[PDB]
Each structure stands twice: as structure tokens, then as C-alpha cells.
Amino acid sequence: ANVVVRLLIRRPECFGPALRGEGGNGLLAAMEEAIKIAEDPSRDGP
Amino acid sequence: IQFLRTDDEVVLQCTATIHKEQQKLCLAAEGFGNRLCFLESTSNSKNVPPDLSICTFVLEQSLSVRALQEMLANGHRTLLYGHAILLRHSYSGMYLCCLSTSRSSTDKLAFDVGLQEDTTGEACWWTIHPASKQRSEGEKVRVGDDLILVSVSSERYLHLSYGNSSWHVDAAFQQTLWSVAPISSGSEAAQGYLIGGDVLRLLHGHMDECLTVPSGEHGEEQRRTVHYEGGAVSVHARSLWRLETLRVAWSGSHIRWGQPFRLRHVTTGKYLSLMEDKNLLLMDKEKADVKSTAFAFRSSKEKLDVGVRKEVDGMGTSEIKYGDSICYIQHVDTGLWLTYQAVDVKSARMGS
Amino acid sequence: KGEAIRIRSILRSLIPLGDLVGVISIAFQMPEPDMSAGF
Numbered sequence: 001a002n003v004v005v006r007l008l009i010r011r012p013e014c015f016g017p018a019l020r021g022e023g024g025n026g027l028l029a030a031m032e033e034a035i036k037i038a039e040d041p042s043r044d045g046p
Numbered sequence: 047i048q049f050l051r052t053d054d055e056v057v058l059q060c061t062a063t064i065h066k067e068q069q070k071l072c073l074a075a076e077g078f079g080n081r082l083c084f085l086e087s088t089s090n091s092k093n094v095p096p097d098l099s100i101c102t103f104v105l106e107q108s109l110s111v112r113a114l115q116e117m118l119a120n121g122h123r124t125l126l127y128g129h130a131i132l133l134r135h136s137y138s139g140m141y142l143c144c145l146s147t148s149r150s151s152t153d154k155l156a157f158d159v160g161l162q163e164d165t166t167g168e169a170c171w172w173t174i175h176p177a178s179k180q181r182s183e184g185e186k187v188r189v190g191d192d193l194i195l196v197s198v199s200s201e202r203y204l205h206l207s208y209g210n211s212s213w214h215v216d217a218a219f220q221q222t223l224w225s226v227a228p229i230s231s232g233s234e235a236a237q238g239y240l241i242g243g244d245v246l247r248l249l250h251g252h253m254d255e256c257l258t259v260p261s262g263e264h265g266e267e268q269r270r271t272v273h274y275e276g277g278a279v280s281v282h283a284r285s286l287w288r289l290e291t292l293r294v295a296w297s298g299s300h301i302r303w304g305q306p307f308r309l310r311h312v313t314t315g316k317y318l319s320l321m322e323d324k325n326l327l328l329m330d331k332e333k334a335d336v337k338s339t340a341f342a343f344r345s346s347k348e349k350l351d352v353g354v355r356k357e358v359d360g361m362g363t364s365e366i367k368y369g370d371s372i373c374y375i376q377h378v379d380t381g382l383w384l385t386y387q388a389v390d391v392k393s394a395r396m397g398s
Numbered sequence: 399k400g401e402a403i404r405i406r407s408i409l410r411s412l413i414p415l416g417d418l419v420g421v422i423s424i425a426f427q428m429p430e431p432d433m434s435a436g437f
Contacts, residue, residue, distance in 0.1 A: 028417050031421050
């Protein structure tokens with residue numbers, strides 16, 4: 001667990017861009033946008 | 047080749063290549079009034095000099111991670127990689143630690159770096175690592191080595207964050223190279239001898255007067271004027287001067303004759319500038335030219351040697367004392383010398 | 399232990415609590431069946 005946390009914090013790209021990064025805010029907006037994409041078939045395989 | 051001992055004053059600089067331009071930004075700390083640190087522009091020192099007084103840190107202890115955790119669960123050493131260091135601010139006396147709150151909203155995960163009084167906990171310690179594959183752990187650290195500082199509490203790197211106005215060093219997971227530049231090696235500082243970066247004043251042999259400016263009862267334009275005065279001004283805050291050396295490394299060494307250095311007023315924060323239409327006055331740092339604000343100390347009145355000393359990368363030699371060391375101010379451009387005048391006419395001679 | 403507290407603080411700083419409670423509180427529908435390839 002310790003070395004996994006260490007590697008994950010050393011390489012911050014492993015976290016989702018909506019959660020981690022200078023862009024997206026976090027899990028709330030990420031999850032609701034994912035729901036909202038799942039409801040809209042224009043963002044999937046036609 | 048010079049090793050980094052303990053109890054020596056160092057400067058922590060870094061390089062930032064932003065907007066297709068390189069710059070050397072150093073780590074500074076105000077100390078009193080605020081806790082968080084900030085950045086100082088070591089480069090571009092031609093018109094705006096950096097406040098080197100607050101960019102100075104001292105390493106107190108160099109313990110391994112085992113010894114550190116052991117002391118936390120409870121001498122002139124040599125800096126080794128992988129160890130943990132304690133950076134005490136030279137001016138404020140507090141210790142560098144990684145804060146818990148966040149200020150820069152662009153990093154929802156980083157912590158700020160600042161100063162704290164107590165040395166308890168894992169916040170005030172920073173473990174050191176190399177930034178190259180040629181130097182492994184356990185090796186002795188030298189000058190010029192690119193180092194990486196990691197927080198002992200948060201396991202975060204001392205990252206150089208970029209912002210429009212939040213040019214603030216944070217504790218992020220992206221590493222950043224940091225250069226260490228020594229100022230005083232902690233060696234035998236010659237007592238009674240002048241050392242660089244000191245705060246001192248000048249007196250006369252048989253006049254008992256000191257170089258000062260008018261007190262706060264007058265406006266700032268009148269305080270800009272410079273003169274000599276005696277009496278209670280011998281012990282005053284407005285009578286002290288600081289020798290700010292142009293160098294960023296070993297500027298707190300033994301100052302020798304002929305080298306240039308700015309004269310900063312600790313009360314006003316301005317430098318002794320000279321424009322030829324007038325005499326010397328005080329001007330701020332935002333327009334302090336090296337050529338206009340650089341001065342030196344000669345041991346005589348002639349012009350036998352001007353461009354004889356260029357660069358000495360070391361502690362130097364104990365040359366200039368305090369009591370029995372008769373210096374003479376000499377400007378780097380015009381080379382003039384100090385003269386006391388009689389501006390006060392006999393109509394008001396027995397006054398001020 | 400100390401390193402355990404450190405890892406816990408790291409996880410807490412990486413994941414906020416308000417995000418967690420908000421993500422828990424979504425109140426998905428209860429559906430003639432439907433497709434379970436969503437929330």
C-alpha cells in the first residue's frame with residue numbers, strides 16, 4: 001500500500017484528468033458528466 | 047570540490063524558462079508579518095537588485111531518516127545525500143516548513159511552504175536527493191550540485207509553481223531542480239573584521255558624527271537628502287547601512303578593497319544613488335542601476351589601482367577591520383570622495 | 399504509527415470529503431426493466 005501510494009503520487013498522470021490536474025474540478029462534476037454522457041448517445045459508438 | 051558543512055548560510059535558487067525566457071528565481075522569506083515564503087529575482091539585477099538579506103538560510107542538523115524518525119518518536123558535520131536537513135531562516139530565526147493550507151487554486155492538491163517557530167513534527171525537515179544519475183545516495187554534496195528537496199511530512203516536492211501573479215513556490219508532486227549557493231562557510235569569521243552583508247555605520251576620528259538622513263518629522267523627499275549628524279543619532283535606526291554585494295555566492299565573505307557593493311539604508315530600503323546634475327541621494331530598488339549605485343572602499347586617496355580585483359570564489363582574507371581601518375568611499379564612475387560641507391550659514395550655525 | 403497517519407493525510411488531501419458525500423448522494427432511479435450499463 002505504501003509503495004503504491006508513493007508511485008501514484010510520483011506519477012500524478014495515473015489519476016483521472018477530471019480529478020487531478022489544473023483543469024477539471026473533481027469527482028462530483030466528473031461523475032455527473034459521465035452520467036450525462038451515458039444519457040446522451042452522441043458521445044459513444046454509433 | 048567544496049563540501050557543504052553544517053551551520054553555514056546558503057541561498058536556494060532555481061531556473062524557470064517561462065514565456066520563452068529563462069530566469070533565475072530564488073527562495074525568499076519575509077519572516078515578520080507573514081508566514082508563507084515567496085520568490086526573488088536574482089537575475090535582472092542590473093536595474094532591480096534582489097533582497098539577498100531575506101533569501102538566506104542556515105542548515106542546522108543533518109540526520110538520516112532513521113535518526114529523524116527516532117528523535118521524533120522519542121557540530122560541523124558534512125552534508126550527504128538522502129539525509130534530512132533543517133533550514134532555519136537567518137533573518138527571522140524561524141524554520142522552513144510545509145504548511146497545511148492552500149493558496150494557489152490551480153493546484154487542488156499542493157501545500158504551501160512557509161516558516162514556523164517550533165521544530166517539532168515532520169513539517170520543518172526536508173530530505174535531500176540528487177538530480178543526476180552520477181551522484182547516488184550517501185555521497186558528499188558539493189557546490190553546483192542540482193538538489194531535490196522533499197517534505198518529510200507530506201512527501202511532496204519543493205515545486206516551482208507558475209501563475210499570472212501567484213509566482214509562489216508550493217509543495218507539489220512535480221520535482222524541481224534547486225541550486226545551493228554558499229554565502230558564509232561557517233568557518234572562522236574574523237572578529238572585528240568587516241564581513242559581507244553586514245549592517246554597520248561609519249564614524250569620524252575626531253568629529254563623533256555619523257552618516258545619516260533626516261528623521262521622520264520631515265517628508266520623504268527631505269528624508270531622501272543625505273548628511274552627517276552627531277549626538278543621539280550615534281545610536282539610531284536611521285543611521286545604519288548595509289553593504290549589498292553584487293554577487294549571489296559568497297557575498298557574505300571578507301570584503302576586500304576595491305570591490306563594488308551597494309549601500310542600502312535599512313530604514314528607508316533605498317540605495318545611495320548619484321546623478322551628475324546633483325549630489326548623492328536615496329532611490330528605490332525598482333531603478334537601482336549597478337553603475338550608478340556601486341561604490342567601493344579605498345585605503346588612500348590616489349588612483350593607483352581600480353580594475354585590479356575581478357573575482358575571488360571563497361571566504362577571502364581578513365583585511366578590513368572595524369575600529370582601526372580608515373576607509374575612503376569611492377564611486378565606481380566618477381571616483382569622487384566624501385567631503386563635509388558648511389551648508390548651514392552662520393545665521394543658523396548654533397541650531398541643528 | 400506515524401507513516402500510517404502520513405498516508406491517511408495524503409489520501410485525505412488527495413480526495414476531499416465533500417466530493418465523496420456528493421458522489422454518494424446521487425439517488426439513482428429504480429426502474430419493464432432497463433439497462434444497467436450506467437450509474
